């Protein structure tokens, strides 16, 4: 209770250090545009849902937009790999927003098979396909490349970070759709896996006037 109170500032901090992190130049991309989406679907669901807990209205519009966005990226990232060119989906910056805007109202005009099954039924395979056909390439590479020099293993971990974010939101909201507090847990797990996995590490940990390893 009064002990778990420290769990809200967690859904009001980590999700803001992120929104601001995105809102730096280099951090602005389609991927970090949808991950920055699950920020308002964790902060709003913490400064508007967690506090008072219309209250059951934004409780659905929040969780039905998550496993929906998770369905988005899983496909976006795919279209990025299946693509004949470089790794970075074609969803333009504006059409990412226009596509972003339509994920909320449809999340508002919205069921476990509509707002949960459907979005997780495909999202797990559109990604499965990906995490898989991302391996064939991973080393269809030149072995010599990297040891004699004179998509790579890096972007292979970027799908590891996006590979657990989609892999934690499943074991957190499944036992519920099959415990209502376990689902809230994925509110301080994303900005937590982004530290020891993706670039965010420095992006936001050093934004707080150089955290620690700032050549301390």
């Amino acid at each position, epitope marked *: 209770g009064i002990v778990m109170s420290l769990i809200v500032l967690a859904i009001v901090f980590g999700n803001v250090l992120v929104i601001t992190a995105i809102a730096f130049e280099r951090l602005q991309t389609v991927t970090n545009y949808f991950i920055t989406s699950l920020a308002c679907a964790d902060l709003v669901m913490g400064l508007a849902v967690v506090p008072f807990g219309f209250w059951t209205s934004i409780d659905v519009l929040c969780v039905t937009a998550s496993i929906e966005t998770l369905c988005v990226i899983a496909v976006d990232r795919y279209f990025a790999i299946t693509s004949p060119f470089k790794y970075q989906s074609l969803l333009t910056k504006n059409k990412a927003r226009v596509i972003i805007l339509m994920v909320w109202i449809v999340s508002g005009l919205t069921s476990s098979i509509v707002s949960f099954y459907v979005p997780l039924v495909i999202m797990v395979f559109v990604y499965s396909r990906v995490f898989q056909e991302a391996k064939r390439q991973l080393q269809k590479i030149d072995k010599s490349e990297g*040891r004699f*020099h004179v998509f790579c293993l890096k972007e292979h971990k970027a799908l590891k970070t996006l590979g657990i974010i989609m892999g934690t939101f499943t074991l957190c909201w499944l036992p519920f759709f099959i415990l209502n507090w376990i689902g809230y847990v994925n509110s301080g797990f994303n900005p937590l896996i982004y530290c020891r996995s993706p670039d965010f590490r420095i992006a936001f940990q050093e934004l707080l006037c150089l955290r620690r390893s700032s*050549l301390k």
Partner: antibody
Amino acid sequence: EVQLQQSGAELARPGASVKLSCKASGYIFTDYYINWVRQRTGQGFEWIGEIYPGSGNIDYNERFKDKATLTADKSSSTAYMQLSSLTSEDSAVYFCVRGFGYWGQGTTLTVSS
Amino acid sequence: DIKMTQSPSSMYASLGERVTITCKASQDINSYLSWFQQKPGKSPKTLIYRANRLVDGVPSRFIGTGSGQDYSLTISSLDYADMGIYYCLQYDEFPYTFGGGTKLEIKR
């Protein structure tokens, strides 16, 4: 001016654990993995594992699977190797290569009483 | 894992002649083989990789040429400083495995 610095001489009591370092300095650490190959006295080379500084991937050789644990330092631009429960036969020269291209100096580790 | 024999072992060539060691692996490494030289009192200096692609700095009289399952490092016009122990390495798959290296001496 390309080079991976090494200790050259390392003494350790049987059963203990040494931790060899390799300070590369003359290129971009994270652009080449770096393997650690052990070469006992006499002759012979036996790959202990390869760790890619840039990512994190550390493919160990079964044999030294549980024995050694590779690790890199993006800042220091130096890498390491953890060799636990050393034995009389773990003694030898340990090489820190840059993916078989440029070899290191060497560390004449010797497990002894 | 992947045995890789390497004849010869012992070898005596006199200056000027072209000496040659041949390496043949167990599997089929896609030319993912390399050749280096161990000199007494020194760390190994790599000469070739990708079965034939001379490393930068290695003298142009060194020549690696094999394919699929058998290769060979070779030098035309053996120079005096060319004395030591050359070994072949494959990095096609884990665990990387070394040859046994042949050793070459110069008849004086």
